[PDB]
Amino acid sequence: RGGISYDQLAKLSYEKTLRNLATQTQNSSKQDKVQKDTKTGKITIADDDKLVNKLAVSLQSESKKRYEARKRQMQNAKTLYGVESFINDKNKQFNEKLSRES
RNA sequence: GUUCGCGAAGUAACCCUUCGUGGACAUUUGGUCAAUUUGAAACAAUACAGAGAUGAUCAGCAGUUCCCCUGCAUAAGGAUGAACCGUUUUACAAAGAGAUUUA
Ligand SMILES: [Mg+2]
Ligand SMILES: [Mg+2]
Ligand SMILES: [Mg+2]
Ligand SMILES: [Mg+2]
């Protein structure tokens, strides 16, 4: 049991997004360079604007999905426990935090 | 202007006066700045509030700050000098079920 370290958590997050990129290519397949300017020193990479848009969309979708999966957790945990005496929400979140200690 | 020469005129008798002409002496101040409104002090007054830890009443001492003010100050005081008192979501996974799809 126990917790998962950050180097093991990062690999599992990297393994998970590779399966999201695998099925994204499978759902697409189901439906149907390097230039180095010598004067400036800058390196320009030419890439597809669709794959850059799909990168920007999927990060926003994962940002909203974790935002909504946490918002429902806020609305559920506020309306679970009311037995022990509280005063405000920061007291409830602290007295619940004492319960996970024991 | 002074002084050292030189030349001419007059008085002289080689000295004085006069005006011509070479030298020498002395040689570069001040402003970062213009004299009332438009290149910048600040108080006071009026209005509106009105002193931290509190259940009430009383001492304070710090800290953080791209706020300082008094003071000789590395002392101390400025309400414990003031401001602080809010807003708060992703380093995120692993297991186990029902609806909607796909081709
Ligand atoms: Mg006091
Ligand atoms: Mg006092
Ligand atoms: Mg203080
Ligand atoms: Mg003080």
Domain boundaries, chain A: 1-102
CB count in 10 Å sphere of residue A92: 18
Strand A34-36 to strand A43-45: parallel, antiparallel, or no bridges (unpaired)?
Answer: antiparallel
- List chain B nucleotides near protein: any atom < 7 Å from a Cβ: 89-94, 102-103
Output the CA A65–ligand 4 centroid distance in Å.
52
How many residues does this entry show for chain A? 102
CA A1 to C1' B12 (Å) is 144
Q: Is the CB of A64 under 7 A from strand B?
A: no
Residue A69 token pair: 């999966």
CA of A53: how far to CAs of A34, A37, A49, A70, in Å? 20, 26, 6, 26
Largest CA distance in chain A: 72
Q: Any idea of the CA torsion for A62, A64, A65, A69, to the nearest 10 degrees?
A: 140
Q: Is the CB of A89 under 7 A from strand B?
A: no
Which long-range contacts does A9-12 make (Cβ < 8 Å, 24+ apart)?
Answer: none
Experimental technique for the deposited model: cryo-EM
Q: At A36, is the secondary structure helix, strand, or coil?
A: strand
- Report resolution in angstroms: 3.2
Question: How far is the C-alpha of A86 from the C-alpha of A99, rounded, in Å?
Answer: 14
Residue A89 token pair: 């929400």
CA A17 to C1' B69 (Å) is 60
